[PDB]
């Protein structure tokens, strides 16, 4: 059966049935906005000062040390078949490479 009651479920179903679960999901949405705004604004300022269409000067010293230092460290050390670096398509590129480009038969294998 399905059990159409009220006590059978009143907390693990929706946040509307609990002011603690409704406020918990509202506090998380606010935090994501700070990351989506502080990050979306950082890219909006780099594009406005790329051609010269706003009141800016030269803001690329603190982030340059964060990007230049992480650009050579994050994309510099790679001497091993790390699987974590391969995404779902990169990992698929290896599994598909042996399935599509992995077969030694030719027209001389009568066995």
């Amino acid at each position: 059966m399905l059990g159409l009651g009220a006590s059978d479920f009143e907390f693990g179903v929706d946040p509307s049935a609990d002011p603690e679960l409704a406020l918990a999901l509202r506090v998380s949405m606010e935090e994501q906005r700070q990351r989506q705004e502080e990050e979306a604004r950082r890219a909006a300022a780099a594009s406005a000062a790329e051609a010269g269409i706003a009141t800016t000067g030269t803001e690329d010293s603190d982030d340059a040390l964060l990007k230049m230092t992480i650009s050579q460290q994050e994309f510099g050390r790679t001497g091993l078949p790390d699987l974590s670096s391969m995404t779902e398509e990169e990992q698929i590129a290896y599994a598909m490479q042996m399935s599509l480009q992995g077969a030694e038969f030719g027209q001389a294998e009568s066995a």
């Binding site: 006590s7 907390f11 609990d18 603690e20 918990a24 999901l25 506090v27 998380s28 949405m29």
Partner: protein, 76 residues
Amino acid sequence: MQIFVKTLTGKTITLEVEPSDTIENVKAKIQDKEGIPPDQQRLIFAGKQLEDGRTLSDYNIQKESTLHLVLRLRGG
């Protein structure tokens, strides 16, 4: 790795844990510090209730990771 756990009153707690620790174990830690029962504690990461059987690594929780803690009730 010390992780941070916020509450519904602007209060964050730091607990030395690991990526292989179970959520139930973390709830017990906050129960010894704040003095609150684990049954009345709900761990939610960025809007994701953690399972008592799963660990912190199952939710990509790294060191200094913030976790939204909530207080559950018994009927009402």
